[PDB]
Amino acid sequence: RLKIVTIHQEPFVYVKPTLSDGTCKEEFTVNGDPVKKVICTGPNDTSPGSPRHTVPQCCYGFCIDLLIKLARTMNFTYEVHLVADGKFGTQERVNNSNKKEWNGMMGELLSGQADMIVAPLTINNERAQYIEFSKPFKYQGLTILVKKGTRITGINDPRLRNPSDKFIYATVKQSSVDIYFRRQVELSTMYRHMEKHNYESAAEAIQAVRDNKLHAFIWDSAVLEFEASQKCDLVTTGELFFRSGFGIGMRKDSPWKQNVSLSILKSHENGFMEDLDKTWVRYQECDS
Numbered sequence: 001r002l003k004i005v006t007i008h009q010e011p012f013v014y015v016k017p018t019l020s021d022g023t024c025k026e027e028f029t030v031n032g033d034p035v036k037k038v039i040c041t042g043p044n045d046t047s048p049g050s051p052r053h054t055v056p057q058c059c060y061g062f063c064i065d066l067l068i069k070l071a072r073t074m075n076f077t078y079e080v081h082l083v084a085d086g087k088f089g090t091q092e093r094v095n096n097s098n099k100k101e102w103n104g105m106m107g108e109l110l111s112g113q114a115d116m117i118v119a120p121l122t123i124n125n126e127r128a129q130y131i132e133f134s135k136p137f138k139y140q141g142l143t144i145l146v147k148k149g150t151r152i153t154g155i156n157d158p159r160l161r162n163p164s165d166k167f168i169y170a171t172v173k174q175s176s177v178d179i180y181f182r183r184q185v186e187l188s189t190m191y192r193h194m195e196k197h198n199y200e201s202a203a204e205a206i207q208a209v210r211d212n213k214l215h216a217f218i219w220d221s222a223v224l225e226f227e228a229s230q231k232c233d234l235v236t237t238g239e240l241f242f243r244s245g246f247g248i249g250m251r252k253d254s255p256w257k258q259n260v261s262l263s264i265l266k267s268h269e270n271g272f273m274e275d276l277d278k279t280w281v282r283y284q285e286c287d288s
């Protein structure tokens with residue numbers, strides 16, 4: 001029985017409380033079919049100062065549908081939890097030593113706290129040195145979320161290249177975004193500005209953009225284009241860098257990998273991923 005680890009990230013993974021009775025609210029998709037919901041245990045409260053608690057919650061979204069398809073196809077049982085530190089996963093020196101460890105879903109996978117990461121997880125070489133990825137289940141990139149009426153030319157935008165406190169930008173801590181900017185020597189000035197303003201989660205950075213507390217949020221286009229398309233006040237701008245995929249994550253040399261990739265290939269071939277897009281990504285006008 002596989003331990004699935006995932007992370008709150010609309011529209012791939014919604015996270016909601018159970019009802020009083022421990023069930024999940026009965027909901028239907030835009031097409032009228034039941035919304036599939038799985039119990040995921042994890043931290044409910046992340047707001048600093050208040051106690052944390054690991055409780056049963058309700059999970060659904062692109063990635064949860066994808067999990068259910070994988071489980072049925074490949075005939076496995078699972079249980080799902082949210083990553084305890086709330087993070088995607090970067091490699092960082094621990095305990096003020098020279099020893100390095102992965103945080104986030106990365107670290108949980110490596111430690112055996114999870115067996116499979118099922119999430120909008122960016123594929124790259126840094127992470128590929130430690131784990132294995134499926135073939136992409138979704139192709140995407142980096143863009144920028146801003147308030148309507150802002151446009152950014154791209155990575156050479158002066159507001160990015162020559163920063164001031166008049167235009168604040170950030171991303172999420174312990175994401176591959178933060179590391180890419182950390183490592184690229186040509187992006188040092190951007191990194192140094194951002195390290196001061198990064199957020200613990202996407203949700204928080206997004207709220208900051210809406211509340212005019214952050215001017216620009218650098219993040220996954222698959223997420224941000226969904227967010228911008230459902231919030232009339234917010235738009236995307238810029239296509240930074242290169243294109244990138246989301247993959248299932250598994251430990252090196254895992255017996256799962258081949259059949260997971262095969263299952264994702266089928267879903268690219270047969271219209272299932274497109275059906276998921278018509279359910280979770282593009283289906284109505286902005287109303288938030």
Ligand SMILES: N[C@H](CNC(=O)C1=[SH]c2c(Br)ccc(F)c2C1)C(=O)O
Nearest residue numbers: 088121122141142175176177180244
């Ligand atoms: N999905 C989250 C956030 N996503 C990431 O950290 C990235 S970095 C990066 C670059 Br550079 C170029 C093109 C891209 F699409 C992405 C996505 C995660 O896995 O941490």
